[PDB]
Design an enzyme around this catalytic site. Structure first.
Site, PDB file in Angstrom:
ATOM      1  N   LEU A  35       1.047  -1.030   0.028  1.00  0.00           N
ATOM      2  CA  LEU A  35       0.430   0.236   0.236  1.00  0.00           C
ATOM      3  C   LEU A  35       0.892   1.355  -0.249  1.00  0.00           C
ATOM      4  O   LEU A  35       2.171   1.228   0.013  1.00  0.00           O
ATOM      5  CB  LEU A  35      -1.257  -0.168   1.182  1.00  0.00           C
ATOM      6  CG  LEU A  35      -2.138  -1.516   1.391  1.00  0.00           C
ATOM      7  CD1 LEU A  35      -2.821  -0.598   2.531  1.00  0.00           C
ATOM      8  CD2 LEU A  35      -2.621  -1.173  -0.412  1.00  0.00           C
ATOM      9  N   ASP A  36       0.025   2.376  -0.073  1.00  0.00           N
ATOM     10  CA  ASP A  36       1.158   3.591   0.094  1.00  0.00           C
ATOM     11  C   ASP A  36      -0.105   4.778   1.429  1.00  0.00           C
ATOM     12  O   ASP A  36      -0.390   4.074   1.598  1.00  0.00           O
ATOM     13  CB  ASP A  36       0.868   4.719  -1.614  1.00  0.00           C
ATOM     14  CG  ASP A  36      -0.665   4.143  -1.458  1.00  0.00           C
ATOM     15  OD1 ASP A  36      -1.568   3.738  -1.198  1.00  0.00           O
ATOM     16  OD2 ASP A  36      -0.456   5.545  -2.750  1.00  0.00           O
ATOM     17  N   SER A  37       1.159   5.553   0.978  1.00  0.00           N
ATOM     18  CA  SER A  37       0.514   6.585   2.613  1.00  0.00           C
ATOM     19  C   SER A  37      -0.879   6.933   2.349  1.00  0.00           C
ATOM     20  O   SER A  37      -1.515   6.909   3.603  1.00  0.00           O
ATOM     21  CB  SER A  37       1.376   7.781   2.617  1.00  0.00           C
ATOM     22  OG  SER A  37       2.409   7.713   1.705  1.00  0.00           O
ATOM     23  N   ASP A  39      -3.206   4.906   1.479  1.00  0.00           N
ATOM     24  CA  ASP A  39      -4.087   4.106   1.813  1.00  0.00           C
ATOM     25  C   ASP A  39      -3.751   3.424   3.341  1.00  0.00           C
ATOM     26  O   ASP A  39      -5.354   2.968   4.127  1.00  0.00           O
ATOM     27  CB  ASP A  39      -3.694   2.807   0.985  1.00  0.00           C
ATOM     28  CG  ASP A  39      -3.902   2.640  -0.580  1.00  0.00           C
ATOM     29  OD1 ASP A  39      -5.160   3.386  -0.452  1.00  0.00           O
ATOM     30  OD2 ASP A  39      -3.649   2.538  -1.485  1.00  0.00           O
TER      31      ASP A  39
END
Ligand SMILES: COC1=C(OC)C(=O)C(C/C=C(\C)CC/C=C(\C)CC/C=C(\C)CC/C=C(\C)CC/C=C(\C)CC/C=C(\C)CC/C=C(\C)CC/C=C(/C)CC/C=C(\C)CCC=C(C)C)=C(C)C1=O
Ligand SMILES: CCCCCCCCCCCCCCCCCC(=O)OC[C@H](COP(=O)([O-])OCC[N+](C)(C)C)OC(=O)CCCCCCCCCCCCCCCCC
Ligand SMILES: CCCCCCCCCCCCCCCCC[C@@H](O)O[C@H](CO[C@H](O)CCCCCCCCCCCCCCC)COP(=O)(O)OCC[N+](C)(C)C
Ligand SMILES: CCCCCCCC/C=C\CCCCCCCC(=O)OC[C@H](COP(=O)(O)OCCN)OC(=O)CCCCCCC/C=C\CCCCCCCC
Ligand SMILES: CCCCCCCC/C=C\CCCCCCCC(=O)O[C@H](COC(=O)CCCCCCC/C=C/CCCCCCCC)COP(=O)(O)OCCN
Ligand SMILES: NC(=O)C1=CN([C@@H]2O[C@H](COP(=O)(O)OP(=O)(O)OC[C@H]3O[C@@H](n4cnc5c(N)ncnc54)[C@H](OP(=O)(O)O)[C@@H]3O)[C@@H](O)[C@H]2O)C=CC1
Ligand SMILES: *P(=O)(O)OCC(C)(C)[C@H](O)C(=O)NCCC(=O)NCCSC(=O)CCCCCCCCCCCCC
Ligand code: SF4
Ligand code: SF4
Ligand code: SF4
Lengths: 77, 114, 156, 341, 208, 176
Positions: A35-37, A39
């Site tokens: 995931l990323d920031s 999410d």
């Protein structure tokens, strides 16, 4: 703590970008789940939606594991 | 060189401000859908918020990021106060524009545009 | 035919009342609304013809779009037009409402209110004199006189 | 191509699309949507009208200066038909009525007028004809409406062999009959259904999808002499569909069975209205009739249109029928109805 | 006499020059330049971060009581590194005079808000922000004032097209006003008016 | 110099106090305003009986546009585009070419009356008195397209209004 873990896993499994089979209580959001920031921000907001207490930005950035989430919830009761 | 910092002295503080603004916009989509009586879903609104946040993902200047979060905060407060109308909220979606072709052959058939 | 005659007389009665009782909404945008005030003034008394300004759009029959319509105002103009109950008419007064006007090539101006609302009469000028606006109002009355709603319905 | 029919611009309001279309029956539901799409892409639109010119005012903003032209026509007047189709390369036929008046029957509006339009257009040199029929256009149908649709479809095909015949299922939109017909039955106590609506299957189609398909059929070069079926993605039983309509409108749904003969009598009672009737016997027959399945005919996917499900656009139509208590309820607040696929 | 030539006032020119020297001496830290135009207008060019000190001095000093802010605007000059030029027009009622203070900034550099000195600066700086993109640091309420809600871009910049990028119309399908890319029935006809012969030798620039 | 608009103090003698008390209890100034309105009621109204009576106008009035001719019938316009150059609103469109007899004459002369601001600069800038702003002001239409005049329409306006246009120009050309 078992109830807290169950609620956290319930919230995580409802998330569309989390694969239920790949999910585990020690799966890293950025590394294991990819995931990323934003999410992770949404996941923390979903946790806030469940346990009904405010998680500040400084604390939220240190919650990159489901185990870290349950630890934070348990410490804050 | 030694440029004046507007709000953030480093890119990490700018990322923090971006995350705060994203939380604010994310938590306001249900209220906006309810108050404006939009026909879209809450998921569609959140997807649009993510998409609008994500088209500035290439920026590496803390001052430009500070200005972007300033403008985002202003347009969040326009939505909360219902200063905007349903017209503008739906202007975020381009529901009336025709699908513009993106391939060379379609552009060649349509006209002279590059 | 008897029914044809009756419906003709009936719609003549209905059109007479509508043309003889016109209630513009108090809606002025720019310098063109001063000439509207002078049409209301004693020299060209509009109340003499049966034309009375009302504030509520629900109690208005005519919208006189008098002034420059901007992008920030077009939603409000459309909203009040919609809230006017039917039958309803539009008179676009002056260059700024007819087309762009002096502000045609501008980022902030709608080039004609007929992009937003259906317009029945176009009164040209910058600003049209009070007599010109009065001529437009009388032309609107003559246009109402030619309506045959019951005559269309009977043959429908 | 004539030098004035070559497309120029970007497909906006002030562009030139190279389409000169005469749209018969543009002063209606499908008509207003088709005219909007044409004027939006920047075409020349001719609007033949028989009504009061006040009822054509909503079509004035649909196109740029000079792009919408209004001419008066008579349905039983080939001279007026020629006058309006004389200078156009596309002719669209949306003329029809859901009831029989004193001067026009189902045979007149669905057989005589379409044949005259197709015949005059062929003489005038019109390149393309689009003709809107119904999905259940059956010659042996219980409904005189649909029998006339079938006969008129055959006559149009004979008169203009290069036609595009489009067969929508049941169009739903803001100004429609379908959802408003079912949602306005709250005034008469309960909801009368034949066999309780358990023997009827319907797949409605969305008005914007229908108009977009009509527009794409004009632009498609290999749809010249074809027949399409415009249907929605989901098939519903009538009981489930009406229950969902009432759930979205937040109205108390009290369905009761009504035998077919009694419902026919009720429909005969309502069709004595000099004005627009609330319901008719042919309307009752069409409502009870299940939508046909025609897998051989092309469709919206073949024209490039992804059909919009009813669950996404029902709140546009049915929010007007809610009370103040329920006006602000969101789209996802009502569970979708069960489909029969 | 010279009926068609505007007469000059050397007394006022001298008074303005003296006061310009006075201010430049009092505030060496910020004042970069002082000019007096030949129609008797004093102009003080300062470093951009001396806005609050210089304005507070010009407002509160006994020999400069510029209590009123006539105007506040900006000028866009793309050829400069600091394209935007903030202009303050002050009026002294006690000495019946007017002064001008000029500051420079670019897109990403804020200017301190002067609402703590003049209250008219509130809406004046809101308009500057809205029309040019200049951000004012400690402003009570900085948002758009003149443009439409959600309008993108700052129209008074020189690189902004005259008709903008979008235009509004009512769409019957969606039953609301929509925003679509601009498209002109008749394009604005741009005229080249400048004469190829020099008009004013007194302003001739060195060939460089 | 200056004056004070409200700086007077009332006299406190018993007569003045009683007069003010009577004005308070008996609504004297209110009745005075009633009397003023009644006076206006019995005056004569200022309303003209339009459309049978028209308000005053002057030779300088700027109404509908017109293209003029010489007494021979030849058009005055020589396609010099000075009006197009000076037009503030960019409402004039002009295209010209040599005529069959070699004259410098226009082939296109358009005025968008929905863009025109009726400022009269075009007839100031015309060196041959071709384009004028005539006396007509009652030319409201029912469609937008009818307000986009072309050369045929403007020449028709000139031919219809030439007598009055000539009279007005004769009356006002010594002030120009
Ligand atoms: C937006 O910026 C702007 C402004 O800033 C706001 C401006 O200021 C202005 C400038 C404008 C102004 C300054 C206007 C300001 C002016 C004023 C405030 C004063 C002007 C006067 C008024 C506003 C008064 C308005 C009054 C109105 C509209 C009343 C009209 C309404 C009616 C008449 C309807 C009500 C009456 C009814 C319904 C009559 C019903 C009667 C019956 C039913 C009786 C019949 C009964 C029966 C039973 C019938 C049977 C009878 C029989 C059979 C008898 C017959 C028998 C016989 C023998 C004959 C401009 C231009 C502007 O732009
Ligand atoms: C409720 C009041 C009772 C006392 C009334 C005393 C007299 C009143 C005198 C004033 C009349 C006011 C009306 C003026 C206009 C005239 C036209 C008009 O009325 O049009 C009405 C409507 C008009 O329909 P409309 O809604 O299209 O009309 C709009 C108005 N127009 C079109 C005229 C501009 O006419 C009809 O309905 C007649 C057609 C046949 C309808 C058959 C209905 C059957 C009965 C209804 C219930 C059925 C289900 C029952 C379920 C249970 C059974 C057990
Ligand atoms: C308040 C209670 C009312 C209850 C309902 C009862 C209604 C009573 C009937 C009222 C009738 C009013 C008649 C109006 C007379 C019209 C006056 C005349 O001028 O009209 C001319 C003709 O108008 C129309 O042609 C006819 C309108 C009146 C006729 C209506 C039909 C007959 C009325 C009877 C009812 C219908 C029943 C018929 C059998 C079914 C046109 O003139 P106009 O251009 O404007 O004037 C412009 C001003 N100028 C002259 C200075 C320039
Ligand atoms: C029981 C009392 C009966 C109530 C009497 C009538 C109440 C008023 C009804 C009403 O006003 O609405 C009817 C409504 C109004 O339509 P609009 O929205 O105005 O469409 C026009 C758009 N331009 O008409 C309808 O559309 C409803 C049509 C469906 C009727 C179906 C017929 C079956 C009902 C009869 C059942 C009774 C059997 C015993
Ligand atoms: C032998 C012994 C007899 C004993 C009886 C003695 C009584 C006789 C003397 C006393 C009578 C006094 C009159 C009573 C009415 C006075 C009302 C009043 O209070 O006056 C005004 C209030 O009245 C008004 O202001 C009126 C405002 C509305 C005026 C608009 C309409 C009036 C104009 C129309 C004239 C009405 C004519 C009446 C005709 C009646 C026909 C039936 C004072 O209010 P202010 O000035 O605001 O100051 C008070 C606080 N400082
Ligand atoms: N909408 C639906 O549910 C479906 C509709 N269709 C068909 O699509 C077409 C358009 O449908 P829809 O928009 O719902 O219908 P509408 O009733 O809303 O519109 C009908 C149009 O035809 C005109 N018209 C009717 N009768 C005559 C006549 N005798 N002479 C001249 N013009 C006439 C009307 O004009 P005016 O108002 O001036 O009288 C109006 O412009 C019809 O052929 C219909 O059968 C097919 C499948 C589904
Ligand atoms: P992780 O932190 O690694 O990733 C974060 C993201 C994905 C944002 C980037 O990788 C990133 O950090 N990029 C750095 C540059 C940057 O800061 N980008 C974001 C700038 S903030 C910004 O763009 C704010 C824009 C406001 C959004 C407008 C909202 C409008 C939505 C309308 C909704 C209406 C529907 C009802
Ligand atoms: S047309 Fe002229 S007078 Fe009327 S609002 Fe526009 S600028 Fe003002
Ligand atoms: S009156 Fe002014 S705006 Fe009108 S055409 Fe002449 S120059 Fe242009
Ligand atoms: S200024 Fe006069 S002569 Fe010149 S182009 Fe215009 S109308 Fe013709």
């Amino acid at each position: 703590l078992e109830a807290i873990k169950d609620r956290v896993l319930y919230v995580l499994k409802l998330y569309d970008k989390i694969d239920p089979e790949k999910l585990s209580v020690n799966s890293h959001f950025m590394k294991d789940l990819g995931l990323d920031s934003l999410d992770q921000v949404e996941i923390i907001m979903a946790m806030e939606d469940e346990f009904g207490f405010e998680i500040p930005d400084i604390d939220a950035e240190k919650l990159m594991c489901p185990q870290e989430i349950v630890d934070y919830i348990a410490d804050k009761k | 060189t030694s440029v004046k910092p507007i709000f953030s002295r480093d890119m990490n503080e700018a990322k923090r401000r971006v995350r705060e603004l994203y939380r604010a916009w994310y938590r306001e989509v249900p209220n906006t859908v309810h108050l404006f009586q939009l026909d879209i879903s809450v998921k569609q609104g959140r997807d649009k918020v993510r998409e609008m946040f994500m088209k500035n993902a290439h920026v590496t200047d803390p001052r430009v990021v500070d200005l972007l979060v300033i403008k985002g905060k202003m347009e969040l407060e326009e939505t909360i106060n219902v200063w905007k109308q349903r017209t503008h909220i739906m202007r975020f979606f381009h529901e009336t524009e025709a699908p513009r072709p993106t391939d060379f052959l379609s552009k060649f058939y349509v006209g002279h545009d590059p | 035919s008897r029914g044809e005659y009756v419906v003709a007389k009936l719609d003549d009665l209905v059109n007479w009342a509508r043309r003889s009782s016109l209630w513009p909404m108090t809606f002025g945008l720019a310098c063109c609304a001063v000439e509207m005030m002078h049409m209301a003034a004693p020299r060209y008394d509009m109340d003499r013809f049966g034309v009375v300004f009302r504030a509520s759009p629900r109690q208005s029959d005519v919208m006189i779009v008098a002034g420059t319509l901007t992008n920030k105002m077009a939603p409000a103009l459309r909203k009040v037009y919609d809230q006017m109950p039917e039958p309803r008419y539009v008179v676009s007064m002056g260059s700024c409402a007819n087309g762009g006007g002096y502000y045609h090539y501008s980022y902030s101006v709608v080039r004609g209110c007929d992009r937003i609302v259906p317009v029945d009469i176009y009164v040209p000028g910058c600003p049209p004199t009070a007599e010109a606006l009065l001529y437009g109002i009388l032309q609107l009355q003559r246009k109402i006189k030619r309506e045959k709603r019951l005559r269309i319905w009977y043959r429908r | 191509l004539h030098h004035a029919l070559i497309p120029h611009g970007k497909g906006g309001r002030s562009s030139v699309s190279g389409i000169v279309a005469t749209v018969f029956g543009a002063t209606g539901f499908l008509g207003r949507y088709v005219v909007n799409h044409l004027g939006r892409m920047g075409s020349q639109v001719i609007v033949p009208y028989r009504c009061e010119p006040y009822d054509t005012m909503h079509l004035r903003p649909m196109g740029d200066l000079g792009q919408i032209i209004f001419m008066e026509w008579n349905g039983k007047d080939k001279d007026s038909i020629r006058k309006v189709v004389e200078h156009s390369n596309v002719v669209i036929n949306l003329v029809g009525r859901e009831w029989e008046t004193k001067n026009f029957d189902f045979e007149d509006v669905f057989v005589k007028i379409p044949h005259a339009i197709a015949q005059v257009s062929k003489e005038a040199g019109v390149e393309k004809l689009i003709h809107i029929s119904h999905l259940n256009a059956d010659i042996k149908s219980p409904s005189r409406y649909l029998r006339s649709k079938a006969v008129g479809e055959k006559e149009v095909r004979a008169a203009f062999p290069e036609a595009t015949i489009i067969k929508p299922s049941d169009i739903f939109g803001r100004e429609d009959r379908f959802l408003n017909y079912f949602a306005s039955m709250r005034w008469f106590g309960g909801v009368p259904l034949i066999s309780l609506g358990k023997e009827t299957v319907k797949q409605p189609v969305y008005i914007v999808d229908v108009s977009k398909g009509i527009i794409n059929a004009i632009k498609d070069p290999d749809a010249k002499g074809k027949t399409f079926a415009f249907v929605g993605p989901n098939r519903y039983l009538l009981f489930d569909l009406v229950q969902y309509i009432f759930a979205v409108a937040y109205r108390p749904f009290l369905p009761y069975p009504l035998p077919h003969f009694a419902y026919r009598w009720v429909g005969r009672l309502f069709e004595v209205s000099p004005f627009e009737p609330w319901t008719t016997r042919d309307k009752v027959e069409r409502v009870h009739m299940s939508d046909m399945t025609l897998p051989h005919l092309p469709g919206l996917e073949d024209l490039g249109i992804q059909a919009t499900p009813l669950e996404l656009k029902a709140i546009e139509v049915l929010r007007r029928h809610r009370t103040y208590r329920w006006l602000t309820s969101e789209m996802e607040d009502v569970k979708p109805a069960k489909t029969v696929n | 006499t010279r009926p068609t030539i505007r007469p000059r006032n050397d007394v006022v020119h001298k008074q303005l020059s003296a006061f310009g020297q006075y201010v430049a001496e009092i505030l060496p830290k910020y004042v970069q330049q002082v000019q007096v135009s030949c129609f008797n207008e004093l102009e003080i060019f300062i470093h951009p971060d001396g806005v609050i000190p210089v304005l507070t001095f010009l407002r509160d000093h006994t020999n400069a009581q510029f209590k009123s802010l006539a105007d506040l605007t900006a000028v866009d000059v793309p050829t400069r590194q600091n394209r935007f030029e903030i202009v303050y027009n002050l009026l002294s009622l006690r000495f019946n005079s007017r002064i001008r203070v000029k500051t420079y900034t670019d897109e990403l550099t804020p200017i301190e808000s002067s609402v703590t000195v003049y209250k008219a600066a509130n809406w004046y700086e809101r308009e500057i922000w809205d029309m040019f993109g200049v951000f004012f640091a400690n402003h009570p309420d900085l948002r758009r004032i003149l443009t439409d809600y959600g309008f993108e871009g700052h129209p008074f910049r020189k690189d902004f097209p005259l008709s903008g990028y979008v235009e509004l119309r009512y769409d019957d399908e969606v039953k609301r006003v929509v925003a679509e890319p601009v498209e002109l029935a008749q394009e604005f006809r741009k005229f080249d008016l400048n004469s190829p012969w020099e008009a004013f030798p007194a302003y001739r620039q060195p060939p460089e | 110099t200056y004056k004070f608009v409200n700086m007077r103090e009332p006299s406190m003698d018993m007569k003045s106090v009683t007069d003010r008390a009577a004005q308070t209890l008996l609504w004297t100034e209110l009745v005075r305003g009633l009397g003023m309105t009644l006076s206006y009621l019995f005056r004569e109204p200022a309303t003209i009986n339009y459309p049978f009576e028209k308000g005053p106008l002057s030779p300088r009035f700027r109404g509908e546009h017109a293209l003029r001719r010489y007494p021979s019938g030849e058009e005055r316009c020589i396609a010099c585009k000075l009006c197009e150059a000076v037009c503030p609103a960019q409402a004039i469109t002009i295209e010209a070419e040599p005529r069959a007899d070699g004259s410098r004459r226009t082939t296109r002369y358009d005025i968008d009356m929905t863009k025109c601001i009726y400022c009269g600069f075009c007839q100031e800038a015309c060196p041959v008195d071709a384009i004028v702003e005539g006396p007509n002001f009652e030319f409201s239409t029912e469609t937008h397209e009818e307000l986009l005049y072309n050369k045929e329409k403007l020449l028709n306006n000139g031919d219809k209004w030439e007598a009055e246009i000539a009279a007005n120009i004769q009356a006002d050309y010594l002030y120009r």
